[PDB]
Amino acid sequence: AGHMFDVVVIGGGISGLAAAKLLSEYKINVLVLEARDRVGGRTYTVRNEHVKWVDVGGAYVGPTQNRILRLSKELGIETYKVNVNERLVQYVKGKTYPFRGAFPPVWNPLAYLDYNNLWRTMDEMGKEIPVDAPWQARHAQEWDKMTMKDLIDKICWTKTAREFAYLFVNINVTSEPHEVSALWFLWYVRQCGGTARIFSVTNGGQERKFVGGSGQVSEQIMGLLGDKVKLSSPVTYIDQTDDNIIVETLNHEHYECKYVISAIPPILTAKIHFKPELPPERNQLIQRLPMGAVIKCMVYYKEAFWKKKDYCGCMIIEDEEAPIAITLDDTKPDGSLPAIMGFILARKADRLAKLHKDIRKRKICELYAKVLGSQEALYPVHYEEKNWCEEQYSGGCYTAYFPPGIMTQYGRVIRQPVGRIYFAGTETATQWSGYMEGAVEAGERAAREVLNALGKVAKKDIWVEEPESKDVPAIEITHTFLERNLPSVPGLLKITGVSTSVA
Amino acid sequence: AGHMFDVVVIGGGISGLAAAKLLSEYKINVLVLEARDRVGGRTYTVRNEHVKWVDVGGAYVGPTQNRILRLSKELGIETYKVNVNERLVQYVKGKTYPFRGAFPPVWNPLAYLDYNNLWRTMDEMGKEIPVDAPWQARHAQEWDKMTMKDLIDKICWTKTAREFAYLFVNINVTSEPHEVSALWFLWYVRQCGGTARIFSVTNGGQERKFVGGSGQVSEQIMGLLGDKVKLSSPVTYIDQTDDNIIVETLNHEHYECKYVISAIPPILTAKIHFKPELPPERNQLIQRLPMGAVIKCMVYYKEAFWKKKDYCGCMIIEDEEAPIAITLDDTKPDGSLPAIMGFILARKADRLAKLHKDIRKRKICELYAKVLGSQEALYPVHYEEKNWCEEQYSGGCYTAYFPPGIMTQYGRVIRQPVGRIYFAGTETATQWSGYMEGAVEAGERAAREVLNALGKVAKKDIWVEEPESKDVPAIEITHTFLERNLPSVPGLLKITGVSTSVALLCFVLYK
Ligand SMILES: *[C]C1=C([C])[C]=C2C(=[C]1)N([C][C]([O])[C]([O])[C]([O])[C]OP([O])(=O)OP([O])(=O)O[C][C]1O[C](N3[C]=NC4=C3N=[C]N=C4[N])[C]([O])[C]1[O])C1=NC(=O)[N]C(=O)C1=N2C#C[C]N([C])[C][C][C]OC1=[C][C]=C(Cl)[C]=C1Cl
Ligand SMILES: *[C]C1=C([C])[C]=C2C(=[C]1)N([C][C]([O])[C]([O])[C]([O])[C]OP([O])(=O)OP([O])(=O)O[C][C]1O[C](N3[C]=NC4=C3N=[C]N=C4[N])[C]([O])[C]1[O])C1=NC(=O)[N]C(=O)C1=N2C#C[C]N([C])[C][C][C]OC1=[C][C]=C(Cl)[C]=C1Cl
Incomplete structure (x- = not known):
């Protein structure tokens, strides 16, 4: 039932658990309230026979994402490189143009x-x-x-x-x-x-995924806590005027604690009613950090027909009408269940969401067809999708974005504590904010802050540098001599003494 | 106790009550849950002996705000013209420049x-x-x-x-x-x-205020409902999957109803947890309509010293440093308690809020001093202020604003119902949205929508035109011939660029 704990963590996300974990390892009686009937939040691995396992949410990790990699490994979770052996393709106005490298080439x-x-x-x-x-x-x-x-x-x-x-x-x-x-x-x-x-995918944050699903990280780290993680328990009130902090949920439950860590998206912080009304700055900021819009879509085929044309799942579609912007080969490591992962972003997100699941699916296929070639793209076996705009307890997906004028006015607060209430969530990270690794930075950072508040951690050892993962080396970034110096369009005209004329 | 009602209205604001009122008049069992220990929300009249009564929130009404005026009158509330007999003043870089009219003059x-x-x-x-x-x-x-x-x-x-x-x-x-x-x-x-x-103040929405305080409108309309308005009851959950809609608050109360009208700011809609997760569009939109930032500040003096210089309280300050942007004479009708109302907006809002009440006060006076003249501005008797960024159940004050790209993507929804849940609040008005009159438009509009859903009102008589208040006539807007035609800076160059070809082409051919 509902009891008293040292620290209460709102958020069963990666950042949430990460904190919860670290806190338990310091023998601290911490509780973790999650609103969904599951855990992992923005990271979510769907499982059914048609696909075995699929990251319908957060999924890719890479070179400098040391924090997540480390925690991932410790939890006994493997990573697998993303397929890029074949050719990439850019779909512009006309048709498809094969290419190799980071960005497409411009002639x-x-x-x-x-x-x-x-x-x-x-x-x-x-x-x-x-x-x-x-x-x-x-x-x-x-x-x-x-x-x-x-x-x-x-x-x-x-x-x-x-x-x-x-x-x-x-x-x-x-x-x-x-x-x-x-x-x-x-x-x-x-x-x-x-x-x-x-x-980059070859050396970027899109280099590889988790074997079994990124979702596992939360699921796992939950098993280590077990008892101390209440699901389907949306925090709805935080009263911190007394010697003990009150925290009631929507299940009608009640818990008291000495400190609180909010591991939920800034915007969703408003789903909570605070006793001492939060300070203007925060109060004001919590209503200006919107969650972006995206629908992650995986289309499954019986065969990776694109490999038959020296094309890897990756496509970069630049054409108003087209539903998907970019795609990747989401086939399994063992060649099992070939499929293509694509994204429907921003404006397009809401537009396509107005269609029927089936129609949308079609549209996507019809696209993949033209972009690739073989109509084999029109005959999918299975199709899995997720529109994160629908999610009540997430808001949207690649984190929140700062609109014009907000960063320089109320931004200075994102990570700043509001009396005994500390803030986690990837949105407060410093490295890879918005990404899974970003979540970890915070989950832990916040955790340590609370520990320091308990005298268990020094004000110094609160922000800890992460040891470069020896399994995924941080290969430096090669910056060509040409790139470093080639003039800008204006630069070329300033060289060619061209500004004294009427073009 | 927490019982069952026909319609449950979330929001003890004007728009909230307005709906509540109209609904009761149609003999409908409606309940109204308010989160604050008071009513009126963004409209709030502070009362103490030092000022008797002061609208520390919404306050001005004008010429075309028929809806609010009508309701105001019906509730037995009077309006009083805002003082503008004296001169207005614009404070620019240098010093103060007296003037008369709508906008300041540019020479x-x-x-x-x-x-x-x-x-x-x-x-x-x-x-x-x-x-x-x-x-x-x-x-x-x-x-x-x-x-x-x-x-x-x-x-x-x-x-x-x-x-x-x-x-x-x-x-x-x-x-x-x-x-x-x-x-x-x-x-x-x-x-x-x-x-x-x-x-405009002379013929604009800043023409006059309510004698006794705009707050009264909500307070009054509450007395007519009495029993049916629960205070200190923040709605926190809405479950509408069953035949009866569930609505639980933070007081641990529980109420069921057939329909719901949300009379709270779009952004604050998120303080609520919805059973069937709202549709993407709404869900998405409810996190993109921020409340502006302002601190309304009244400084009281023992004498309207500005009138001694043919200056009415009104000042338009254009100078980075200066705390207040615009001001008005907030003295009482009977000349009682002379005072000046000023606003601290946007960027400045948060900046000054970082100061101590006293310091802020000083800064303001020091300003009013220089702008006006007499140092009599440095010796206030009383000072009342309100920073609406602090308010948990309001967010900020002149309504919400749409940022870039949002209107054309998720905007089409603001007023659209989400199954048995209809939306009110001035933010959903069509005329004077953001203003008190705007609140009423919605409060009633939403109300009628629900009535229509009950068969009590036709799909037509749902959007009702308001009869022009005969007490505050809608004097048309005079648009000068000059204004209508004077060229734009580019326009003048386009015109001259041709006066040049004409003068030099005509003369040269001659010699
Ligand atoms: C959605 C998404 C997608 C779709 C994708 C992705 C993502 C997403 N990501 C991100 C992640 O996921 C995140 O960040 C995380 O997850 C976060 O975490 P946190 O912080 O922890 O948070 P969350 O999760 O959200 O959680 C929270 C929690 O809590 C809860 N709640 C709330 N509220 C409340 C609660 N409870 C109680 N009470 C209350 N009130 C909830 O519910 C939850 O559970 C990502 N990341 C990473 O790292 N990675 C990846 O991959 C990802 N993904 C993505 C990305 C993308 N990018 C950016 C881009 C791509 C590009 O691509 C390319 C390139 C190149 C070429 Cl050539 C091509 C292509 Cl295609
Ligand atoms: C704040 C503010 C101020 C400071 C001022 C003003 C204003 C404000 N206004 C506005 C009004 O107030 C509004 O709109 C209204 O009030 C609205 O209503 P509604 O819609 O109803 O809403 P509300 O109120 O907010 O309420 C809501 C309610 O609910 C509740 N809740 C929440 N959440 C919740 C709840 N419950 C339960 N549960 C839950 N969850 C709350 O709490 C509440 O109660 C205004 N308006 C008008 O009309 N008028 C006026 O006057 C006003 N004011 C202002 C204006 C200003 N203007 C714009 C500008 C000025 C200019 O001036 C000048 C001119 C010229 C020269 Cl030469 C000088 C000068 Cl200085």
Whole structure:
């Protein structure tokens, strides 16, 4: 039944459990309330005979995501490289264009320069931002007033390199470039390791998945806690005016504790009614950090027909109409159950959600067909999907995004405690915020904060550096001499003394 | 005790009660749950001996706000004109500049053109937007991707007319021009009756207040319901999968009903846990409609010293440092308790809130001093303030604002019902959304929707036009011939660029 504990953790997510774990290891009586009838939250592994196991939520891990990898291993969970042996393909206006490498290739000289200048510039601006304190950047104020679009259109002279920029935004933040803050975005990418890493599959965060499903990490870490993790128990009230903190749920349950760690998305923090009304700053901020929109879709075929054309599941579709933006081969390691994973992002997310499951499915197939070639794409065996906009206790999926003007006003708070209530959740991470590893950073960070508050941990050993995973080495990023110096579209015209004319 | 009712209304605000009222008048067993220990919500009249009565929240009403005026009167509440007999003043870079009229005057020719072009253009674009469906406008998609700043900087050539535009945004939406959607804003202003009305005091929505406090409207309409309005009962759960809708609060209470009307701010809708998880669209939208930031501040003096200089309380301060943006004479009708009402908006809101009450107060006085003149401004008798960012069950104050890209994606839902749950709240109004009158539009609209769902009201008589208040006539808006035609800064260059070809082409051929 409902009793008294030392620390009560709201959130059965990775970040939640991570904290719960660490806390138990310090022999602390911690309780963990989860609202869903399951655990893992934004990470969710669906199991049925048609697919065995599938990460319908969080799934990919990579090179610098040491924190998650470590915890993953400790829990006895394996990683498996994502298939990229074949060719990648870019679908632009006309048709499909095979290619190999990080980003697709651009052959128009001007575009090429603009395109390159883009990525390079975004990273240049990024270096100027404090990973742990975006709002502290030099040009911090000027930038946060600018929409990622504004910025993109201010540095892209090629309609090509520009639309591409947009997509990049869609793919990494599940939102439109005009919906988010340039300042924030620049940070998000930087906080992950620059454009290169955040996008690469061969050496990026999309390098590999978990054998058995990323979901397992939460499931596992729950078994180690067992008794101390109440499911279907949505926290709904936190009263911390007394010597003991009160915490009642929606099950009508009641629990008291000495400290609280919130391991749920900032925006969802509002599902809770706080006794001493939270401070303006927080109160105000908790209503400005929206969850992006995405529908993860896996289409299963009886055979990886794309391999027959030296094409790996990966496709980068740039075409208004098309439902999916990017895709990947989600076939199993043992070649079992070939399938293709694709994403429906931002604007498209809501648009396609207006259709019937079947129709949507079709649309997707019809697409994969044209992009690839063989109509073998029109005859799927099974189809699994997940629209995270529906989820009440998640809001959306690739974390929350900061809109224009918010980062530089109420941002300084995300991780700041509100008297005995500490904050976790990947949204408060510093490295890979938004990703699973990001969740861990926080889950633990918050945990240690509370431990320090109990005298068990020094104010120093609260923020701990992670040992580079020897199983997934952090191969440095090769930055070509050309890339480092090739002029920008404007740069080329300033070299060719071209600005004194009427084009 | 917690029983069964026909309709349960979440929200003891004006829009809430309005609905509750209308529903009772149709002999419907309706219940109204309010989270605060009081009623009126964003409208709140503070009472103490030092000020008798003061609207520390919503307060002004005007010419086209017929809905609120009507309900106000019916409840036996009077209105009193806002003082503007004296001179208004604009505080710019240098010092104070007296003036009379709607907007302050701009004397630099170019500025004047740009400045004028501004307002006119905002209204032109507005006319193109469907009051009841912003997202339906022609250039709807192009605009909603553009920040009100983006737009302002794209049509203002004068650093002057531009900074002014910003302020206008701050004052009307309690947010920064770069935080909100140009599309949305343009609508907000249009939905109120264009720039002219939304800002004017002499014939605008700031024409007059309620004698006794706007708060009274809710308080009153509560007495008519009495028993059927539970205070300190924050709704926390809504289960509507059964034949009867379940609704539990935070008091541990439980109520069942046939229909629900949500009369609370969109963003605050999330304080509730819904049984059948709301649809993506709504779910998604409910996390994108933030409440602006403002701190209403009244400073009381023993004498309206500003009247001694032919200055009425009104001041329009344009200067980064200065705490208050705009002010008004908040003295009482009978000259009793002279005082000045000022606002601390957007960025400034949070900044000043970091100070100690006393310090803030000082800063404000020090300002009023310089702006006006006499140091009599440094010796206040009493000071009352309210920072609405603090409020848990309100979020902020001049309603919610739509950020870039949201209106054209999830906007189409604000008023749309989610199975037996209908939506009220001023944020869903069509006329004066954000204002008290706006609240009423909705409160009733939603009410009728539910009545119609009960067969008591036709699908037609659901959206009812309001009879123009004969006590506060809707005087039309005079649009000068000059204003209607004077060229824009670009326009003047386009015209001159041709006066040049004409003068030099005519003369040269001659010699
Ligand atoms: C959704 C999603 C998707 C779809 C995908 C993905 C994701 C997502 N991710 C992310 C993750 O998942 C996250 O971050 C995590 O999970 C987080 O965690 P946390 O922090 O812990 O949180 P959560 O989970 O949310 O949880 C919470 C919890 O709690 C609860 N609650 C609430 N409220 C409440 C509660 N309880 C009580 N009470 C109350 N009130 C809930 O319910 C829960 O449980 C990810 N991540 C990572 O790491 N990875 C991955 O993979 C992922 N995924 C993704 C990504 C993507 N990216 C970005 C992009 C991609 C790209 O791709 C590419 C590239 C290149 C080329 Cl060429 C191609 C392609 Cl395709
Ligand atoms: C805050 C604010 C202020 C400060 C001011 C003002 C305002 C405000 N306003 C607004 C109003 O107030 C509003 O809109 C209303 O009130 C709304 O209503 P409704 O819709 O009903 O809502 P509410 O109230 O919020 O309520 C809700 C309720 O519910 C509850 N809850 C929540 N949640 C929950 C609950 N319960 C249970 N459960 C749950 N969950 C709450 O608590 C509540 O109770 C206004 N309006 C009008 O009409 N008027 C006025 O006056 C106002 N005010 C303002 C305005 C301003 N404007 C815009 C601008 C100004 C300008 O000025 C000038 C001009 C010219 C010259 Cl030369 C100078 C100057 Cl200074």
